[PDB]
């Protein structure tokens, strides 16, 4: 996260760290949507251009985390995976269209002050909240800067990072890049004339873009950190998998398995 700040304790209790068993490595962000289902980006599990292919026995999820690096005794809970589900029409070849995956946990996690699921939007919630100018929130343990000379701070945070970012008009998202944009993604971030800055970066992918409903106080996952061109570049935006546009597939997987 570029231009963010340390999360408060319990501020993002649905945040999940997708973790490689051996070697022990942060793989991606993810989000808890029930006691046994976790949402992430497809490219975290399958990305052929970099020869990436992880299956259920390779990974685990760590829930309730704050520190990026410490094992957080009596706070975080870890779970093995039972099954991985990648969207059947995930397009890694070109524009990361439908960059979404689901993971079923081997055993349900018990909720706590630090562990709690986020809501998924329905049609009116998506129509109401996902509008240009409205701000959502992105969280992750990824890089704090694209390049080293961009600021004086460290490369990686010691603690989960948070930034709020406005949704961008679709024609502005489209004009910002030569990559072919689809209706299954949206982009967020500030324009140069807005002065403020911030973005998701390398290591934040798979994590949630969430918005708080002004009408029922609940937090809804609208997006998944997917891709971008650099991080926090003037005239560029971070791109997010559009969660509601893929909710029919999400519901199919969960109702069937």
């Amino acid at each position: 996260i570029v231009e963010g700040s340390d999360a408060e304790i319990g501020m993002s209790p649905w945040q999940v760290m997708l973790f490689r068993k051996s070697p022990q490595e942060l793989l991606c962000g993810a989000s808890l949507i029930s006691d046994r289902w976790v949402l992430t980006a497809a490219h975290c599990l399958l990305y052929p251009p970099w020869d990436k292919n992880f299956t259920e026995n390779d990974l685990l999820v760590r829930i309730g985390k704050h520190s990026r690096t410490r094992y957080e005794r009596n706070i975080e809970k870890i779970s093995m995976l039972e099954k991985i589900y990648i969207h059947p029409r995930y397009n890694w070849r070109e524009n990361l269209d439908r960059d979404i995956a689901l993971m079923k946990l081997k055993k349900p996690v018990a909720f706590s002050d630090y562990i709690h699921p986020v809501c998924l939007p329905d049609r009116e919630t998506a129509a109401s909240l996902l509008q240009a100018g409205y701000k959502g929130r992105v969280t992750g343990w990824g890089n704090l800067k694209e390049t080293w000379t961009a600021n004086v701070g460290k490369g990686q945070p010691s603690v989960l990072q948070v930034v709020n970012l406005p949704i961008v008009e679709r024609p502005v998202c489209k004009d910002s890049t030569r990559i072919r944009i689809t209706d299954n993604m949206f982009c967020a971030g500030y324009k140069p004339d807005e002065g403020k800055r911030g973005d998701a970066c390398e290591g934040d992918s798979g994590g949630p873009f969430v918005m708080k409903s002004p009408f029922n106080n609940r937090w809804y996952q609208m997006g998944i950190v997917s891709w971008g061109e650099g991080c926090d570049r003037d005239g560029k935006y971070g791109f997010y998998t559009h969660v509601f546009r893929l909710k029919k597939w999400i519901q199919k997987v969960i109702d069937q398995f």
Partner: peptide, 30 residues
């Protein structure tokens, strides 16, 4: 789950976090 999206240390305690007002403000001014 009918309890989703309500944080135990915030909404369930009627406490706001340090930056969520900027999200709610964007519904008014954004």
């Amino acid at each position: 789950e009918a309890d989703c999206g309500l944080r135990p240390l915030f909404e369930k305690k009627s406490l706001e976090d340090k930056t969520e007002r900027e999200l709610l403000e964007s519904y008014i001014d954004g």
